[PDB]
C-alpha cells in the first residue's frame, strides 16, 4: 500500500529526482487536509458498529436477501455480510486515513469479485449496503469528510462492478 | 406440414432427411385418412360450433353487446362470426397439413398488433378460442377431440 | 449445483429514460462532445426546470 | 441428518460406518413415524406454542416490551414471534433429521454475532425458547416432549 | 457565477426511513395486537 | 439437450457398452410412462397461462413485499418480466417432462441463473417459491384431471427448486 | 433422439411443443417396443454379425488384408474387427434413439480425416458396415431389416 | 455433503414453511429404503477388501496397465490404484447409504480429472476399474442395492467423463 | 448510466413516498446550477484540444514516460494516450451535465484498472495527467466551474489509484 | 509478432540507441542460418500430416486415450487432437523461420493452459506427443534443423505445463 | 519484416508458407549484406546527416525558429533535432528490416493526431525528412541512396 | 505469379509496393533467365519423365493394373498418363510463374473432390508426383531440380 506522501515519494523516487515544487505542494495540501481526517477517522472508530448497524437496517433488513431462499438469510450467512461490511468500512477508514485507494487494491479488491462470484453473493445487494454504509457515515461525519469516505466507498463498489 | 418441416431441417443442415423423420412422414401418411376424417366433419358442422361459442362468449362477457364495447352493429357481429369461422377453418387447415405452420402463416404471425390496431381485446378473444374449443370438442368424438385438442390448445397458447 | 460460474457482473439497466440521460448517451453513443445540439437540450430543460 | 454426521465421522476416520451407527440408523428408520408424528404435531400446533411462550417471555422480561427494548413496538413484538416461530421450525427440522445439524447450520453459527449487531438479548432469546419447551411439553406427553427437549436443550446450550 | 458547484457544494443530508416489517409478517402483527 | 435414452446412451457408450437388460428395463420403463409424460405435457399446453398467472398471484400473496416498493416486482415492467421468467421456467418444465431428464434444465435455465440474478438484483428465494408453487398447482390439477402416473411431474421442479435453491444446511 | 429434436425445435421457436411434434414423439413412443426388439436382436447376434460381415468383407477385398494393407496382420485384423464392432454398437445406439444422431456425434465427426490419418481405405470401412447390414438383415424379419438398414445405409453415406 | 432428510429440510427451508405433506411422503420413502441400504452397507463394509480385489484381478491384472512401461507398474502406484478403488467404493457406500451424489460431486469428483491428467493415472482403464467394482458389487449384494450402487459408481464414472 | 435526477427519483420510489423536503432541494441545487454547467462544458467541447495541449506539456512531456523505455514513446501509444486525456475530459463533462459519477462507473471505471494493468500504463503519470487537466480547466473555465469538474476528473483520480 | 530482425530492432529501440556492431552479429547468424530455415520449413511442409502420423502412431494410438473412456475415445475428439497437433507443428514451422518464439507465447500458449484444464485435456500426455513429433522430424529434417525445431516445441511443452 | 508479413498472411489462411514465399524469405537472407552494408553508413556518419539537415531546414525554412514559430526557443530547437535523429534512426531500422513495417509500428502510426496535439508543422517535418534524404544521397553512392532514399521518401510520403 | 499477389497485398494495405518488394521484383526478374531455362529443359524432356513415371508407378503399386483397379485397360493407362502429364504442365507453369498460384487455380482445389469422385488412389498419384520428382532429379542439375523440387513437394503437401 501508499499513502499521498508515499505515492508523492516512490513517484519522486522512480523519476530518480529530489522533490520539486508540485510535489511539495501536494504534500502541503496533504498536511493541510489531515486533521479533518483524523477527527473523521476518530469519529468512525468510536461509532464503527453504529454505521454498519444503520446501514443494514437502512438497505437488507426485512427484504428479500435476509428473507428466506436469500443470501442473507441463515445466522452464519448475516455474520458474514456484517464481518464482510466491517471489513469495508475498516478499510475504507485506512483508505481516508492515507488518502489513497491503494490498499483497496491490495487488500480488498484483488479477488472480492472471482471470491463473490464463486460464493454467489448478490454483487447488487452488497452494492446497496455500501451506499447505505456511505449515506449513514456521510450523516455521522460530516460534509467533506463524508465526501472522502462516498469516494473510498464508491471505489469499493467500483472494484465489486 | 411435418413434410415441409423436416424438408427445411434437411436442406438447413445440409443433408438428405433421416431415417426418424421419414418415419415421421410415414407416419403422417397413415394418420392422414382420420385427418381428412376430422376435415371433413368440422366443414359439414362448423355452423352449430359457431353458434354455440359465439353465444357462449357474448353471455360470458357482456360488454361488446353493452355499451362501452366494439360489436355494437351487425356487421361487427359478422365480422366476429367470420372471424371464428377463419379460425376454425385455419383449425382444420392446419389438422390437415398436420402442423401449426399453415396457420402461422395465415392468422398467427401478428395477431396481437393486429387486434390492438382494431381495439379488440386479446384475452376476450382467448376466452373465444376455449369456449368454441368447448364446442367443437363436444361436438366431435372422443378420440378425435383428443388428436384435434391441441391445435387449438396451441391456438390459445399462441394468442396468450 | 451447477459445476461452473461466468461471474456475476453488476448489471445497470435503464429504469426510464430522463432527457439529460438521453442527450447525453446521444452523444456518448456517438463518441463526441455535447455539441450545440445537446446543449440547446440541456439548456432548455434546466430553463423549464 | 444422523446419516449425514455418521458418514462424516466416519469419512474423517476414512472408513466405513461401524456395526453401531448402523443399527443407530436402524432404530432411526424404524422411529421415522414416530418422529415425523411429532413433527406434525409441531406444525399443527405452531401458532399456540409460540403464543404462549410469548405470553410468558413477555411477562418474565418486561424490559423486552419496554419502552428504549430491543423488541419495543408492535413490529418489533412481530419480528421477535417471527424468530420464535423460526427457532419452533428449526426444532421441527431437527427432530425430522435426527442430528442438531440441521439446527445449528441455520440458526446457531454466527447467532451471537447477529444478535450483537441487532442489540436483542441472546439469553432473552433463550428464555423464549425455553419457554417453547415448556408449551410443547405442557401440549405433548413425556417420553416424545422428552425426545423434542433434547434437541430445544441443545438450542438453549448453544445459544445461551 | 458561484451559484455552480452542484457537486463540489456542500451535499444535502438525506431523509431514508429505516426499513420496518412488511405485510410478509402480518400473521405476527396481528399476533401482537391481539397479545398486547 | 439430452433426453434419458441419450443419457443412457452416454453412460453405456462412455464404459464402451452394449444394451443389457437393465438399459432395456431402463428404456421400457421410459417408453411406458411416456404416454403419460405427453398427457401431463398436453395439460401443461393446455392450463400454461392461468396457471403461471395464478401461480404469480398466489406468489405475491405469500410474499406481498415483491409487489410493494424496493420489491423486484414492483413496477409492471418488473411484472412481466417476472410472469416471462415464470412462463420460462413452465416452458422447460414442461420440455423435461417430455424428456424425463433435468439435462435440458441444466444446460438452459441453471447454468447462469444465480449469476443473472446476483447481477439485476433479482431474488432468488421468491423464485423458487415461485416454482414450488407451480409444482403444487400443476401436481394437484393432474390429480383432478385423468392422469394415471403423477410422479414424475414433481421431478423437474424439484431439480430447479435445489440447483438454483441456495444450501442452507 | 427424437425428442431432443422435437424439443430443440420447440425451443428455436420459444414455443411451447406443437401438436405435430407431440404426435410424432407419441409415434416414437409407440415404435419405442420395435426399435427395442431390434436393438435387442442386435446385440444378441452381435459377436456373429462382426464375424461373417468381417468374414465377408475380407474375402471380397483381400487388398486390405494382403501385405502392404492397412489390416494386414493379426493384431491389425483384430483392430478391424474392433472398428466394425465399434460400429454396430453405435448402430445399436441409434436404433435405440429412434435416430442417427448418437452415431453421427460419437462416430462419424471427423471419420474422414481420422481413417486417413490412419492410412485406412473410407470406402473399404463403408464396404464393412455393408457386410454388417447384409447380415443383420438376414438376421431378422423384413421390416426390422429396413428399420435397421436405414441406419447402416445412413453410415454408408456419412463414410461414403 | 447433502442426504435425502437433509435435501428435503434445505428445500423446505428455502421454501420458509413447514414440512408439508410431500415432504412427509419422501421421508417416508427413504426410511423404507433405509433398511436395504443399511444392510448393503454392511454387506459392502464386511467386504470391503474381496470387492477390489476381484474387480482388480477381472479389469486391470495381466495387462499393459499393470505391465512394466503401465501406470500401474510400479507397486507403490498399484497401491495407489487400490487405495483409490476403495475411496470410490467407500464413497459409493456413502452415496447408497445417503441416497444422493452431493458427497461425489464434492469430495470425489472435486478436481479428480485434473488430479489424474497432472498424475498421468489412465481415465479409461480407472473408468473400466469402476465397472468391474459395479459389477463384483452387484453379484455379490443382489440386483435391487447392486443396483442402487451401480447408480453411483456410474455418477462417478461419469463425473470421469 | 444514470443522472442526479434518476438517482433522486430512484431513491424516492425505493422510498415509495413523494419529493418531501431535502429531493427537492437537491433538484433545485441541480435545476439552479445546470445552466453555467452547460455553460462550462460549452467552453470545454470549445477548447477540448488546447486542454489536453498544455496539460500533456505540462505533465507528461520531457520526462522518462516520453523518453524510449516509456510506456509513451512512440506515435502510436502517444495518439493513444491523447485519445483517453479526450475520454477522461468527456466523460468528465458527462459526469458533469449528469450530476452524477454513473457513466463514470459504468463506462470508465468498469474496466480501466483492467487495461491499464495489462498494458503497463503508468498509474502515478495518468492520476497527474488528470490533475494537469483539472487545474488547466481550473484556469479555463473558472474557479467553481473548474472544480465542478474537477470532483469528477479526481473521481476518475481515486479510480485510478 | 516478432522474428529475430523485429527483436533486435525493438530490443535497440527500447533504449533508443542505433545499432551496434554486437546487434549487427545477430543478423549475420540469422542470415546465415535462413536458407537452412527456408529449406526446413520446405521439407515439414511438403511432409506436414506425415510426422502427425508417425507421432500419433508412435505415443497416442494404443494407449489408453483412444479406448472408449479416453480423451480421445469419439472421432470427433480424436480429429480434434490431429488438430492440435496441425496447430503445433504449424506455429512451430512459423516459430522457426521467424527465429524468435513471440508468435507461440501470442497466439498458441498464452491461454491454452486453462482451456485444456477446463476441456480436461492430458497435458502430459499430449506433450508427450509433441516430443514424438519432435522426435520424428528430428529424423526427418537433420540435426541442426532438428534441434531448431526442438527448441520452439519445447517452448510449447513449457507453456503448457 | 518479410518473414513476419508473410508469416502472418500464411497463419491468417491457416496455411504452411508457400514455396512462392519460401524463396523470397531465402534470397531476402542471402541479400542482407548491402543492407546491413547501408545500415552501419548510416550509424557511423549518423550525427553528420543530422547537423546538416538541421542547417539546410533551418536556411529553408526561416519561420520554424522566428518568433511565434513552433520551434522557437533552445529546447524547442534541441527537441527538433532530437525528432530528426529519431527518424533517421527509423530509416535505419527500415534498412536493417528491409522493410517498412517498424517504421510503421514505431514512427508512421497517430503522427498526423501527435503532431496536431503538439503543434509542429507535420509538411516541415516532411521537408526534415527530405533534407535528411538528401544529404544522405550526397554522402553515400548511387544505387545506395536509391535503397535508402527508398525508405526516405517512403516516410516523406507518409508525411505528405 | 508473385508480382501479382504482390500487387494484391500493397492493394489489401492500400499503399505502393515497398522497397522490400520492389527487392522481390528485382530478384524475380533476375531469376527469370535461369528459371525459364529450366522449364525450357524439363519441358524438353517432357516425353520420357512421364513415361518413366508410369513404368515406376506401375512396379510401386501394381493393383492399378491388376483386375480391379481403376486403370484396367488401354485407354484407361492413356487417361492416367494423360493426368500425369497434365500435372507435369502444372509443374511447368509454376516454374515459369514462380509461384504456386497457376497450380492452385488449374488443378489442386477439389483434386480431393475429383479423384474421390473418379475412385482415383489419391496417395497413388501422390507416388506418381514423387517418381516424377525422382526422375526429374535425375536428369536435372542439383540447384534446378532444388528449385523445382519445392513446387513438387508443395504438390505432394496439398495432393496426398
Ligand atoms: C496517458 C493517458 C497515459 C497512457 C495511455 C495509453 N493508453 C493506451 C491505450 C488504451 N487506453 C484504453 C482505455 C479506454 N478506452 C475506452 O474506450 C475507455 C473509456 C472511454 C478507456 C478508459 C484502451 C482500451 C487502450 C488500448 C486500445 C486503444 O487505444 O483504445 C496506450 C497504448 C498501449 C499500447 O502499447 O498500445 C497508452 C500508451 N500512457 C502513458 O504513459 C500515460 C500515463
Ligand atoms: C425475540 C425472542 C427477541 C427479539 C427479536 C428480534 N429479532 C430481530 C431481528 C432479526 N432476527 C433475525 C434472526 C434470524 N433470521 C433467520 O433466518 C434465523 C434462523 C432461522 C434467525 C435466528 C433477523 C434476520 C433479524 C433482522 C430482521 C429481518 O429479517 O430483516 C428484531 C428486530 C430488530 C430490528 O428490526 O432492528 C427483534 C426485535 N428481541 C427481543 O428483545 C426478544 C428477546
Ligand atoms: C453482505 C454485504 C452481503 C453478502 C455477504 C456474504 N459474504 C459471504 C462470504 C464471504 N465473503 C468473502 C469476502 C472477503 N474476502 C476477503 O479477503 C475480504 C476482505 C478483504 C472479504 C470481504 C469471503 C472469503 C467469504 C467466504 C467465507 C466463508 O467461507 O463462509 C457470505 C456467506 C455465503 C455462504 O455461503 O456462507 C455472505 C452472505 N451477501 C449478501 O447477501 C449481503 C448483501
Ligand atoms: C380498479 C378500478 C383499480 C385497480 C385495482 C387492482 N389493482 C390490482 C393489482 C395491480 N395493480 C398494478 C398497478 C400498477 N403498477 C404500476 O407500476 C403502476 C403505476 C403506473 C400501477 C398503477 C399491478 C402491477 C398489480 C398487480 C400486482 C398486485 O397484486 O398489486 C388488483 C389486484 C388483482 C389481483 O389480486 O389479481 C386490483 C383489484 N387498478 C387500477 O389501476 C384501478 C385504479
Ligand atoms: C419472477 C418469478 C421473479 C422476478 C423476475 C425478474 N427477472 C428479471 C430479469 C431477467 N431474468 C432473466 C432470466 C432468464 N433469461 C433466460 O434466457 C432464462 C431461461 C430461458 C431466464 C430464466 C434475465 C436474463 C433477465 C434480464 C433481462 C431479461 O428480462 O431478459 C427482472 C427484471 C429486473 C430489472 O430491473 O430489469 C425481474 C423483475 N423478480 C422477482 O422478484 C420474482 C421472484
Ligand atoms: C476394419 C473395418 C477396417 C480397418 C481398421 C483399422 N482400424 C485401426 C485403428 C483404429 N481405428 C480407430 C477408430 C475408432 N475408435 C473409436 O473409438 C471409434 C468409434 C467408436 C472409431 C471409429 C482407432 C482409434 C484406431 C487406433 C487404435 C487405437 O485404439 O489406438 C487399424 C490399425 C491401423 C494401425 O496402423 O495401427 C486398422 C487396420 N482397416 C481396414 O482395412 C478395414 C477396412
Ligand atoms: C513369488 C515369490 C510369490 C508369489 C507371487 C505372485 N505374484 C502375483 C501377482 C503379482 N505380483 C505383482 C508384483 C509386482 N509388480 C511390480 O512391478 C513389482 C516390483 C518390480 C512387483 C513386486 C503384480 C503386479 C502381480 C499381478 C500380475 C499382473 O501382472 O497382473 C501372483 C498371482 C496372483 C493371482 O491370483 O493372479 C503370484 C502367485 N506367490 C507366492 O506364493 C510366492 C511367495
Ligand atoms: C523538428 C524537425 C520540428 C519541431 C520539433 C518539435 N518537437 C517537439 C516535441 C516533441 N516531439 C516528439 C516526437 C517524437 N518522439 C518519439 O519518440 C517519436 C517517434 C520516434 C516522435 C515522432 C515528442 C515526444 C515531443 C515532446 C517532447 C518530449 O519528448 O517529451 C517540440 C516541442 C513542442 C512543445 O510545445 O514543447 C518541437 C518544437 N518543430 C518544428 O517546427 C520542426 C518542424
Redesign the interface.
Known amino acids: 500500500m501508499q499513502d499521498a506522501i508515499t505515492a508523492v515519494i516512490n513517484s519522486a523516487d522512480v523519476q530518480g529526482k529530489y522533490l520539486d515544487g508540485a510535489a511539495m505542494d501536494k504534500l502541503k495540501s496533504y498536511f493541510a487536509s489531515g486533521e479533518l481526517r483524523v477527527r473523521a477517522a476518530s469519529v468512525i472508530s468510536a461509532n464503527a458498529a453504529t454505521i454498519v448497524k444503520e446501514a443494514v437496517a437502512k438497505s437488507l433488513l426485512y427484504s428479500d436477501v435476509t428473507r428466506p431462499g436469500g443470501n442473507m438469510y441463515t445466522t452464519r450467512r448475516y455474520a458474514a455480510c456484517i464481518r464482510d461490511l466491517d471489513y469495508y468500512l475498516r478499510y475504507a477508514t485506512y483508505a481516508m486515513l492515507a488518502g489513497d485507494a491503494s490498499i483497496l487494491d491490495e487488500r480488498v479488491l484483488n479477488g472480492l469479485k472471482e471470491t463473490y462470484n464463486s460464493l454467489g453473493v448478490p454483487i447488487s445487494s452488497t452494492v446497496q449496503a455500501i451506499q447505505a454504509i456511505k449515506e449513514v457515515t456521510a450523516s455521522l461525519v460530516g460534509a467533506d469528510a463524508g465526501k472522502e469516505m462516498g469516494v473510498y466507498l464508491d471505489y469499493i463498489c467500483s472494484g465489486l462492478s | 406440414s411435418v413434410v415441409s418441416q423436416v424438408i427445411l431441417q434437411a436442406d438447413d443442415q445440409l443433408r438428405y432427411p433421416t431415417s426418424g423423420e421419414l418415419k415421421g412422414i410415414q407416419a403422417f401418411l397413415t394418420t392422414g385418412a382420420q385427418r381428412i376424417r376430422i376435415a371433413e366433419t368440422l366443414a359439414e358442422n362448423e355452423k352449430k360450433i359457431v353458434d354455440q361459442a359465439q353465444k357462449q362468449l357474448f353471455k360470458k362477457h357482456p360488454e361488446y353487446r353493452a355499451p362501452g364495447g366494439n360489436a355494437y352493429g351487425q356487421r361487427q357481429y359478422n365480422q366476429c362470426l367470420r372471424d371464428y369461422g377463419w379460425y376454425l377453418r385455419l383449425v382444420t387447415y392446419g389438422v390437415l397439413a398436420g402442423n401449426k405452420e399453415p396457420i402461422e402463416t395465415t392468422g398467427l404471425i401478428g395477431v396481437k398488433e393486429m387486434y390492438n390496431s382494431l381495439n379488440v381485446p386479446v384475452p376476450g378473444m382467448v376466452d373465444a378460442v376455449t369456449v368454441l374449443k368447448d364446442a367443437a370438442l363436444g361436438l366431435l368424438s372422443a378420440e378425435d377431440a383428443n388428436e384435434t385438442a391441441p391445435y387449438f390448445d396451441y391456438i390459445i397458447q399462441f394468442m396468450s | 449445483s451447477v459445476k461452473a460460474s461466468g461471474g456475476s457482473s453488476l448489471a445497470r439497466p435503464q429504469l426510464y429514460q430522463t432527457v439529460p440521460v438521453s442527450a447525453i448517451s446521444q452523444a456518448e453513443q456517438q463518441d463526441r462532445f455535447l455539441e450545440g445540439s445537446e446543449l440547446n437540450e440541456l439548456t432548455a430543460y434546466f430553463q423549464s426546470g | 441428518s444422523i446419516v449425514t454426521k455418521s458418514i462424516v465421522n466416519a469419512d474423517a476416520e476414512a472408513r466405513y460406518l461401524s456395526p453401531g451407527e448402523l443399527d443407530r440408523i436402524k432404530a432411526f428408520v424404524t422411529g421415522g413415524a414416530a418422529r415425523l408424528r411429532i413433527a406434525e404435531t409441531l406444525t399443527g400446533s405452531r401458532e399456540t406454542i409460540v403464543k404462549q411462550a410469548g405470553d410468558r417471555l413477555f411477562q418474565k422480561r418486561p424490559d423486552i416490551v419496554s419502552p428504549g427494548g430491543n423488541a419495543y413496538g408492535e413490529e418489533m413484538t412481530a419480528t421477535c414471534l417471527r424468530d420464535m416461530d423460526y427457532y419452533l421450525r428449526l426444532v421441527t427440522y431437527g427432530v425430522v433429521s435426527g442430528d442438531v445439524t440441521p439446527i445449528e447450520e441455520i440458526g446457531l453459527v454466527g447467532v451471537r454475532e447477529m444478535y450483537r449487531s441487532l442489540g436483542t438479548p441472546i439469553e432473552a432469546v433463550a428464555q423464549s425458547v425455553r419457554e417453547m419447551k415448556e408449551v410443547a411439553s405442557g401440549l405433548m406427553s413425556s417420553d416424545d416432549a422428552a425426545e423434542a427437549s433434547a434437541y430445544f436443550d441443545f438450542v438453549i446450550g448453544k445459544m445461551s | ?25 402480518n ?3 396481528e ?3 391481539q ?1 398486547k | 439437450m439430452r433426453d434419458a435414452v441419450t443419457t443412457l446412451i452416454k453412460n453405456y457408450d462412455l464404459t464402451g457398452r452394449y444394451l443389457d437388460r437393465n438399459a432395456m428395463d431402463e428404456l421400457k420403463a421410459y417408453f411406458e410412462s411416456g404416454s403419460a409424460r405427453i398427457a401431463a405435457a398436453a395439460m401443461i399446453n393446455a392450463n400454461s397461462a392461468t396457471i403461471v398467472k395464478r401461480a404469480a398471484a398466489q406468489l405475491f400473496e405469500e410474499i406481498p413485499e415483491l409487489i410493494r416498493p424496493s420489491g423486484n416486482a414492483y413496477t409492471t415492467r418488473r411484472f412481466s418480466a417476472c410472469l416471462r421468467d415464470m412462463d420460462y421456467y413452465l416452458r422447460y418444465a414442461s420440455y423435461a417432462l417430455i424428456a424425463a431428464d433435468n439435462n435440458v434444465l441444466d444446460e438452459r435455465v441453471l447454468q447462469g441463473l444465480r449469476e443473472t440474478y446476483n447481477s439485476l438484483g433479482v431474488p432468488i428465494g421468491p423464485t423458487v417459491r415461485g416454482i414450488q408453487i407451480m409444482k403444487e398447482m400443476i401436481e394437484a390439477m393432474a390429480e383432478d384431471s385423468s392422469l394415471n402416473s403423477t410422479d414424475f411431474i414433481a421431478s423437474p421442479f424439484d431439480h430447479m427448486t435445489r440447483e438454483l435453491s441456495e444450501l442452507s444446511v
Open positions: 457565477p458561484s451559484q455552480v458547484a452542484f457537486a463540489s457544494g456542500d451535499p444535502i443530508p438525506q431523509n431514508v426511513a429505516r426499513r420496518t416489517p412488511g405485510p410478509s409478517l400473521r405476527f402483527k399476533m401482537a395486537r397479545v
